[model samples]
Target: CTTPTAVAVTFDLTATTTYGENIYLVGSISQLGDWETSDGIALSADKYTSSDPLWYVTVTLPAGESFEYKFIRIESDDSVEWESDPNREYTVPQACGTSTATVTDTWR
Candidate 1:
């Protein structure tokens, strides 16, 4: 028997927008909502502190993986917007140990 290789990925962002309850993290990988802007992984505002505007989420995924992603905001009425050109990219470490990875960025 073999243990599964996986990593805990935490996504952090500082985006202050009037559009609430519609922020999401979309990417090229299935774990990140498969680049589907309208149906992406939602971020929670609960972690946000008064000193700074921050949104974050942690997801467990297979380790040693590479992918591209971006933050998006889909308005209540379905109007959507992405973080801008040149989508973000990242790679998870291949180590066979339990660990976590993080991605931090600000809205552009």
Candidate 2:
């Protein structure tokens, strides 16, 4: 059996601020050993950080499993929950850093 599995979650990041802002995408895995979290999907694009606003980052999770994620506004340096849809199955603490989006390996 594998010690820890890995998963990758790709998504777009947008800033609600009017000017140039830096937002950090913090993600984590659950304790059940079934999924991984996407930690820090920072923006690296040149114009991506320009006045155009909003960028994208591809987080390379562990490998071999699945996980959940969400967009957090860590620039203000406070805990803020965006908005989660009621339809999605969210497992708190099991991996509450983000909402439960359901990440799984299709080949496994």
Candidate 3:
């Protein structure tokens, strides 16, 4: 069968934050904001709490897409706290047969 054009990537992040702070996904891919803060996708904290903070977002992206990204914290004061050091990276596996990929990462 011909390869599927895109795949659904479920990006999961675990980053703890103080009250009023939120996490966002920003990176090389446009779906990740293309390195722009304003355009970034705000990760959802549906399964969050003081003991377990899980921020995640799912986006349909071109198959086999490789990109560099960073998790950022938007403070209540409007300041941004970017992930430390080298940027994070991920490559969506080619169709092969899978239509989705899941990645999990802890805050650095």
Candidate topping TM-score: 1
Q: In candidate 1, what are the lDDT values of residues 1-108, reduced to their tens digit?
A: 122455666677776644555567777777776778766777766666566767766655564676677787767644677868887766776556556777774652
Pick the lDDT winner. 3
Query: Distance from true position, residue 43, model 2, in Å?
Result: 3.9
Which clashing pairs does model 2 show? 6-62, 6-63, 6-64, 7-63, 28-37
Q: List the residue pairs that clash in candidate 1.
A: none
Candidate 2 lDDT: 0.36
State which candidate, 1 or 3, has the greater lDDT: 3
TM-score of predicted structure 1: 0.76
Q: How close is candidate 3 to the true structure, as a TM-score?
A: 0.75
Superposed Cα deviation of residue 46, candidate 3 (Å): 1.4
Model 3 C-alpha lDDT per residue in residues 1-65, reported as the tens digit of each score: 34576666666777665567677767778866677655676677787666788777766566576
C-alpha positional error of residue 72 in candidate 2 after TM-score superposition, expressed in Å: 0.8
Q: Relative to the unseen true structure, what is the Cα RMSD of model 2?
A: 10.4
